[model samples]
Target: GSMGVPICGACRRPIEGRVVNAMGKQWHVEHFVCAKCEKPFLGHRHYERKGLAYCETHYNQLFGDV
Candidate 1:
């Protein structure tokens, strides 16, 4: 399997992993230190659901510009 992280668009950060959102038609970042999650993986991935993005454990945990 490929264990490589891609560079982020907003910031040049390494995106640890990718998750395929079936039925949603998209591939997303899933990894160790997610800029959005700000927490360690507890066995789930992050993705955008209903216009929101967050870790699987923290699903739908969205944030606005601070």
Candidate 2:
């Protein structure tokens, strides 16, 4: 049997603590930030667009114009 270590998408390092699984990849809990604000989500909900992640406010501001 074989097991693979989860790598962080942002830092490219193996995860040791909490892991955030989003955008079809793994990220350190603190590394998962909004694309616009660069702020960590910290258990708050996030919005995704075209493969990138964004905070609710930014997501609404950027894409809600339609």
Candidate 3:
């Protein structure tokens, strides 16, 4: 049923498989990857910047400049 589908937080589309919880929202695992590095977070703690998600390594590299 449509009710069983969890919407992806990034794309706002129904998820067909695994779900990921981040930024207080639900997402499809594929849609929740790091915005900069484009790597899957794998349910790990991701860093957020300007509403985009980033991995720890990329996050530090980005913020390290500013």
Candidate with the larger lDDT of 1 and 3:
3
Best by lDDT: 2
Model 3 steric clash total: 0
lDDT at residue 53 of model 3 (Cα atoms): 80
lDDT of 3 by residue, 1-66 (tens): 436778898889988888987777888887788879788776677777766788887877777337
The numbered model that scores best in TM-score is: 2
lDDT of 2 at 39: 80
What TM-scores do the predictions have? 0.26, 0.84, 0.63
lDDT of each: 0.45, 0.85, 0.79
Model 1, 18-58: lDDT tens digits are: 54433333333332334464653435544444554546545
Which pairs of residues have clashing backbones in candidate 1?
45-56
Model 1: per-residue Cα lDDT at residue 49: 46
Ranking of candidates on lDDT, top first? 2, 3, 1
Q: Report residue 33 deviation for candidate 2 (angstroms).
A: 0.4
State the TM-score for model 3.
Answer: 0.63
Q: Model 1 TM-score?
A: 0.26
CA deviation > 4 Å runs, candidate 3: 1-4, 10-12, 16-18, 23-25, 64-66
Put down candidate 2 lDDT per residue, 1-66, tens digits, no spaces: 786788989999998888899889998889999888988987788887768888888877778435
